[PDB]
């Protein structure tokens, strides 16, 4: 975008972080997806020393 | 032997019952147990000796309460009218108009049985103080406002209507409309402009009062 009335909107209204929940029923749409989820149950496992 | 002549009274018992619910729920003065008339008592009083009912005795006058004068000062009597003829002739409707002319009511609720003459459906706005409301006996077998989906209909007076247009800074027509001949808006007997408040169950707030206009 090309002016400063728009650059503030792209940082405050339609940015990603404010679009965390869906506006459908309030469920989240962000999140880690495949690599780290199955990776995280190894670091949080009890044998991580 | 009395098998047709029973659920032709059991409907007319309920047809009588919804009218005195209809006249009560407007705000007129019909008492508690004149609504809750048993079918035994409906056969003990209005029915004659022959094993049948008779409907002239069912016709009556209704008057406002002490509170439907204070809130709606343009309110007067009410002549709930049943009929004995199945075919409503236009000559017999002269008696209906003159009996509202004579006793000088506010409204006369005619109630028919089967049909009214198409030349008799023109005398219905023919009295500019006293408009006429008509209902079938089959159109009143169940009071429709009892159903779990139909919400509580409360009509308003022109001084909180005035505060209603002032609250949201409204035009007089930018409300959701209700129809002219909607059966609920004939049950409440709405003339045009008469804003009715509707308290419905919003699924995420419970009780929630909205409004609607009549045109």
């Amino acid at each position: 975008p090309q002016n400063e009335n728009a650059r503030a909107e792209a940082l405050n209204l339609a940015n990603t972080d404010s679009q965390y929940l869906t506006p459908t029923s309030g469920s989240p749409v962000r999140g880690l997806i495949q690599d780290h989820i199955s990776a995280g149950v190894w670091l949080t496992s009890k044998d991580s020393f | 032997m009395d098998q047709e002549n029973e659920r032709n009274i059991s409907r007319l018992w309920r047809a009588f019952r919804t009218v005195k619910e209809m006249v009560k729920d407007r705000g007129y003065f019909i008492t508690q147990e004149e609504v809750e008339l048993p079918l035994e008592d409906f056969k003990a009083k209005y029915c004659d000796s022959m094993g049948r009912p008779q409907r002239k005795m069912m016709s009556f006058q209704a008057n406002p309460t002490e509170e439907s004068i204070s809130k709606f000062p343009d309110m007067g009597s009410l002549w709930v009218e049943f009929c004995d003829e199945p075919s409503v002739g236009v000559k017999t409707m002269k008696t209906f108009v003159i009996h509202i002319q004579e006793k000088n009511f506010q409204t006369g609720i005619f109630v028919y049985q089967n049909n009214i003459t198409p030349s008799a459906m023109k005398l219905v706005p023919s009295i500019p103080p006293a408009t006429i409301e008509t209902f079938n006996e089959a159109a009143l077998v169940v009071n429709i406002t009892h159903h779990e989906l139909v919400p509580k209909h409360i009509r308003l007076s022109s001084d909180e209507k005035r505060e209603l247009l002032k609250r949201y800074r409204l035009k007089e027509s930018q409300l959701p409309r209700i129809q002219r001949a909607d059966p609920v808006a004939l049950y409440l007997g709405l003339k045009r402009g008469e804003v009715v408040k509707i308290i419905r169950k919003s699924e995420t707030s419970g009780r929630y009062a909205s409004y609607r206009i009549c045109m």
Binding site: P1, N3, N5, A6, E9, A10, L13, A14 | -
Partner: protein, 57 residues
């Protein structure tokens, strides 16, 4: 493994400025002609849905 036909080395493009039209004074289509990105119908009705009206103006 099988290296496929269609690749990304004929897909991407960039446009900052260039050829308007006459009837519209609007930019031009064409990957060999400085193609203009189209902001379309359901692209119009998502900027409204964010509430922004200077990312639409």
């Amino acid at each position: 493994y099988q290296r496929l036909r269609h690749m990304v080395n004929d897909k991407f493009q960039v446009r900052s400025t260039g050829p308007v039209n006459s009837l519209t004074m609007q930019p031009v289509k064409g990957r060999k002609r400085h193609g203009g990105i189209r902001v379309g119908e359901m692209e119009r009705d998502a900027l409204i849905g964010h509430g922004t009206s200077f990312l639409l103006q």
